[model samples]
Target: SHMMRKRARIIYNPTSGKEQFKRELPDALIKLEKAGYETSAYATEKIGDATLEAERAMHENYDVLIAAGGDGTLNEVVNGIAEKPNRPKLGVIPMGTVNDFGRALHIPNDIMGALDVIIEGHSTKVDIGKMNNRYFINLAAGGQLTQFEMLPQMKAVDLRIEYDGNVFQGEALLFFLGLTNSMKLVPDAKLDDGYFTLIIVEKSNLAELGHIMTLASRGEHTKHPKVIYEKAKAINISSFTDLQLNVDGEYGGKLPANFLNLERHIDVFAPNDIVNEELINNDH
Candidate 1:
């Protein structure tokens, strides 16, 4: 009988973070080797390619599957394996324009530091947001609005939104649901808390909208009169007009959508402080 070494597969986007990961690949694998994993890699070829590779890794039964890129790459990996009955422990190397997932989990953005978290091998299960059939790690949104980084002129669509059992009928400027508080978009939000913060902005005049936007930037918009902020386990939205769904900063699809938070859906390697916090809670 042959006893095989623990195996790990790396799924990364070569162009992510301006193609910084390729140079660190050998060192990454070496560290994994020193930590006793027989490791291999797959560089994503195109958009959605990482998902394909991640699904393949799940089927292959690797013990650890590390995603090295920004939130987009991590999102692909999550989608690929979220439906599986068996999942490899997840590892992350935050090389992206924004490392929301990593930041949320307190995983460092430094290449070796992230790998060291994996090497130290402490992890905790974290929730995922499922929209329709897809999955997201950070947040999802449907709106006629722009992010803090850029302001875009948008057209409000007729939307009928529901949370829990209550119905909201209105022309919404934006509706955002977050899985983590990394962006501080919802300052009081908590990851692993089994629910997401839902923030909806009602249609308002340009002046009021501007005020709300200003308040939101300072993470102080929760109580603004025009903004409805709450927590929910599920959310549903429908519209007669076409509405796009943005999941983890990627255009997922059109909405007439349903969102569910799958509590502690997958385990991920993270910083010790987060790991210890979850461990204590789970023990209690």
Candidate 2:
């Protein structure tokens, strides 16, 4: 009987997004159970709960591991499993205010709709971005130390950033590192391209920065002299002062970090059209 069914484990955040996943839990389990899956669900108890639960599921050797919640929950799960050798396939059921990762994967936010993609059994290997000891699905950012609204000072940090053996060293206002194009900030990025888009906003006067912001809103900032936009397989950053790492909108860690694109690192379920439209089409 064990051989007749595949095992699926769901790790979901209870208070994620609208906090309504609990109401749809029964229906999801039934759907999986009917589709020949011996299914189980875990309601994350607190922050980082999903990460621990996902690691346990891997040890238990489940065939499919589903991450249900916002980008943070899924980011934790990826960190837990991305390093494992015999990793199970991944599924996303987005339940977050900004489901950046889910939107990038073309996975619908509707609980059942996202689950249906998994049941349909279509998946593809996608890049998993890593910075220091953490993994991020959507994108990562740094160098925005002055953007905060509390009587902000013009904080400038000297950073030496290297990519593909080339070097860029200077003071920066903000830097965006993205694995996918949806970052809005890095509008031309592409997922699964085996490269990460690095956007550097050089330090500028208040008036110049304002112009850059206006241009960025229209996806036209990359051409500005103050903006450095390029793609690379790996990036190295070293700074004199501690730099904050905003990974997938969560506080990941401080930097002096190395970021790499782990190409096709994990397989994820998504609609067929999504795969064809975004990743496959870009292959040519």
Candidate 3:
């Protein structure tokens, strides 16, 4: 029954990254339609709303729930879908900010390539990240990068675009330009390493900040000397002071939590784009 008709739902963010998602989505759905898959599309209108949509889909028991947007959208979908006792196969249409999870998964950034993948939701085991109680596909970070996520809504995506285009490591350069600078002090962060990718870079280290962003854009932040990569089966992050931990791309609560690593809990529909198994080696 491989060709038996299947059910799918795509939850998107209308305001994420740029407005292009409004248009690109149709092309994606078109391909899916041609492929004989029933599809439902939902666009997010406010913060934390996408999660609700994702949870609804899980309850409804759709064969697959596709997250169509940026990293933030993906984070919400991951949290909602993974919460289900019987989670479904996952598909991603990364179109929002940073799109780190998509990049790490080697999901194409273009509309055509992404839809092509959707047409083919081949299930495969893939690494899943965890911080505190939340699950992430890319990273869990705090420290300075936290401020960038706090940009005013007036031009949220624009700020990320500008900052990424002009990356630096030192906190001073970031602060001098009125750009937010930060780093994860907790080195040893890695995928499947049984722990969250914890890093703590001071806000004042502009040079290091620039470098972090530069590499992060390319999914190479784990290799930087300033970046501390680790794997933990169970992680406890408690901040002496209040700070938001960046899960995927959305904001989560301040530390003092036990992050349980749920390795390969969900299946992905990808074209051999899964990350290396070593990324989450528990002994690291």
Candidate 4:
């Protein structure tokens, strides 16, 4: 049975969830002991510590390395394993502020669901989008979306640069006002294909406001004169000037850089059979 003693390690943010996973993750590991798994836990300490620790775990032959934290933590874990020749599988605990990756994959962003998927072995190795040397499990966005996300010009009304609910609510309205005129709202901005999504907007292009408005709402802004959306194995958009880049949800410096799709990088465990089907169906 020692051959069945394969390993799975969870790299977690102990301070991430509502309940400290320092206790919860260890308990989860103990439960996994019954499933022929030898689960281990590693907590991150610094900004990019997860990636470094993940890489070390992979090199040490961890059969799989699970990421249990927020989106930023997921990004670090992703970047950590990009260079692994035979990469380890990924398990997501989806205990983040915004879990777009878990949402899109229908992974049921909950604690019990998280453990269920790992034990069920319902994993699919789908592609992750890459920008420069970074990896994103969700999105790579810039231009107008970047304006809303990246640059913090001034607080909206009742505000400071500090995180304020009122400020965020007001800014949401203003941002959507701009978003309406800019991207027009694309309801299906999140597509399941192993591809990239791009949106470009400039205030001067008010003449083309009708086209931009749909990207935010309709999800059909895949085509607009001012907007360009293309799918490719790799994308080099840096030939232009003045572009800020955000990978997943984290702003990654600025760029004149590249983004590409790396397929089937890891077997990712999700919560539901439908999710498993999508992953298997979408990936080669």
Candidate 5:
């Protein structure tokens, strides 16, 4: 049985966060080995390296693929395995500046605590969003508001968005379709739920937009007159003007995009309490 121990591949970004994951690498490997895994690690060399390493891990039949770094690294890992028929159970070590997906799953931010969650081995199926050809674990956003530098004088763009059966046609500041509640824009959003929390903010003056953002930080913006909040299973968006897209914090392509919620798509290691609570609430 020792000779047949399960395999684990850790794909880490060397330059991510404070770059401390390298120093803790040996300790992490020892812990996995003690927990009966044949563990190995690959340090990413450049941008998009994690994705390639993750794909190779899947082909090699790794039982678990642990992503170590920030949200970018995790996003790459998810993209690599999301489309595959058989995906390794995903584990996370939140070493990124913003670990929204990890926090959504209630995985601890501390390295040892995160490793403990993985070693304990409780996993649950969660939703993933597919935008055109790429996949996102946390969010898909569009419009001029996503551009940080253009925020002060943000220009509303013409957009035609169709989600499920409903349609919104007009100028909009920004739109966010999200899976997890970490963004705080959608406080009650559920990770495994079959729908995405779609938030669309219509054209507003600078002062009004500022007020709406203040409310959004407190998760109260949905009731604002200029805001539209709905749960959608599918969304199609097109724009006449140039509009950029953001998927999981990175620049995704331009609009004329189709967003589909792949419900309960991947199995991920998470905290026991959170997993149990979801199971009981959902009767799963």
Candidate 6:
């Protein structure tokens, strides 16, 4: 009797954000049921559990895989599904402290509202960055600020960056390569564009660096003398001293890494206003 309904698997982080998704689970199921989806849920037990859940859903041929949590949880789900063939459509419930990916897509932060967006079924193909073997939905960064506790002894390092055949050699404080404008670091970035906005802060004093961060709120930092902003399709970064890489907010190993922009790699459920209009006309 239930054979005609589509299936959706929700992989959620129990501790993410205010942990409210658990309380709304039954309501979410009810809503999805009304929308004709046979829904199942999984609460991630550990740091990497969501990835496993997403992979399981993919192999089982679920129609949709909804990631409910913060940017970290979304990144995990993306890693699990992005490289696989025939990836299921992705749905996001922005239950994280910093849901930059969801914000970029204009997915609602309200639990039920976000689910409605999924049920309504408007999706857009968006670019995802591949840093080494991992996939990042929003950003890939390298610098002292990314190093957290290591900042006590933080110092600029000599970096050699080659991007689409152009090179920059310098001692720099940090760099950010972003896919979405909501990242604030690169306010001009476009989600579906086949490019990554790269920003490099070159050798600024602590006070000056702080000022740049302040200016970023208005996206005016790109014009600063010490800031280097460019757009590239491919980038390779190598450093003489140890530098940490941050992928979508979590520590993602050290540098000597290669980055490629996988353009329009994933189709994600999003609000109509944020959807790629061309995709809508061509596909439907």
Q: Pick the candidate with the highest TM-score.
A: 2
Query: Residue by residue across 1-284, what tens digits does model 1's lDDT show?
Result: 13357899999888888688999899998988878899999998898899999888877979899999889889999999996988999999998988988877778878999998988877788889889888998888776543243323555567888898788898877888888766566655667777878888777788877887788778777768978888888899898878777888878788789999988888998776444332224421
Give the best candidate by lDDT.
5
lDDT of each: 0.82, 0.81, 0.57, 0.58, 0.84, 0.82
Ranking the candidates on TM-score from highest down gives: 2, 5, 1, 6, 4, 3
Tens digit of lDDT per residue, candidate 4, span 1-284? 33477788888887775645676765788767777778877888888899898878866777777888887788799888885687777888878766666765676676767878777776666677666677776665543232332223312221111111111111210111010111133433323345444343333233445444544345554455434333345555532334344556567676555666666565677654563333335432
Clashing pairs in 1: none
Candidate 5 vs candidate 6: which has greater lDDT?
5
Candidate 5 lDDT by residue in tens digits, 1-284: 34457899999987878888899999999999988889999999987899988887877988999999988898899989987977999999999988988877788989999999998887888889998898888888887644422344556888999999999999888888988766454656677777988988888887777878777667688878988899999999998788888889889989899999999988888876554332323332
Error of 6 at 95 (Å): 1.3
Q: What local lDDT score does residue 231 receive in model 4, on the 0 to 100 scale?
A: 36
> What is every candidate's alpha-carbon RMSD to the true fold?
3.2, 2.9, 9.6, 9.3, 2.8, 3.6
Model 6 regions lying over 4 Å from their true place: 1-4, 145-154, 183-187, 205-218, 273-284
What lDDT does candidate 1 reach at residue 91?
Answer: 95
123, model 4: CA deviation in Å?
1.1
After superposition, candidate 1 runs with Cα above 4 Å error: 1-4, 145-152, 273-284
What is the TM-score of each predicted model, taking all chains together?
0.90, 0.91, 0.67, 0.75, 0.91, 0.88
Better of 1 and 3 by TM-score: 1
Off by over 4 Å in 5: 1-4, 145-152, 205-214, 274-284
Question: Candidate 1 overall Cα lDDT vs. reference?
Answer: 0.82
In candidate 3, how many Å is residue 202 off? 10
Any residue pairs clashing in model 2, and if so which? none
lDDT ranking, high to low: 5, 6, 1, 2, 4, 3
For model 2, how many clashes? 0
